[PDB]
Amino acid sequence: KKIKIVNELAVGPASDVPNGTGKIYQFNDDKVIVVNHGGSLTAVSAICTHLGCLVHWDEAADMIACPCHGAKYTQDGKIISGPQPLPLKQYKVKIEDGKIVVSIAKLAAA
């Protein structure tokens, strides 16, 4: 009673993103930042929804920071502060065979 289409990609070894760090990967047309912090491995779009620069993980401040107009986001992409209109799109992410597997789903009813 629902159709959904999932894109799925093993982007790199789990050892790429050890604790306290974040790394940017290509996901087809988007760029995703995968973050490993506080026991939690998350994945969100790395492109600011304001005007489209790349973000990075700031471990000391426990935040994602955008270098262009000062946007600050949570590890999960939620808005902390800045001019950005939207949160960064949330991905799913898992470790499989020692690999970081990122995925996103788009739904549709039958």
Next chain:
Amino acid sequence: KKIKIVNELAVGPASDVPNGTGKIYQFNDDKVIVVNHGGSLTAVSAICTHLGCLVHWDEAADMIACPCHGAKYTQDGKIISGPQPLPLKQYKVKIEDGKIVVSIAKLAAA
């Protein structure tokens, strides 16, 4: 004894790029990073020559850094280290009427 074609664009107010900072601008088909550091206002292509992520200025480290795979460049776009094949193409930049004017030339001899 030389003819050249110059693209020129007043990209924003000079107040946009104070000392110790760098800013990204659309320059027709390229994107340029203008950096103000050490009394020197420079402008180079913002597109990393490895795989094309947008770069940013790192004032603390005195370098242009690409967030994807670690490319480092000097303020003038020269390669410091990383997987990139090429330096960032250099633009010329000056202040007029409190505005940042970026320009680049393509040659023709006669």
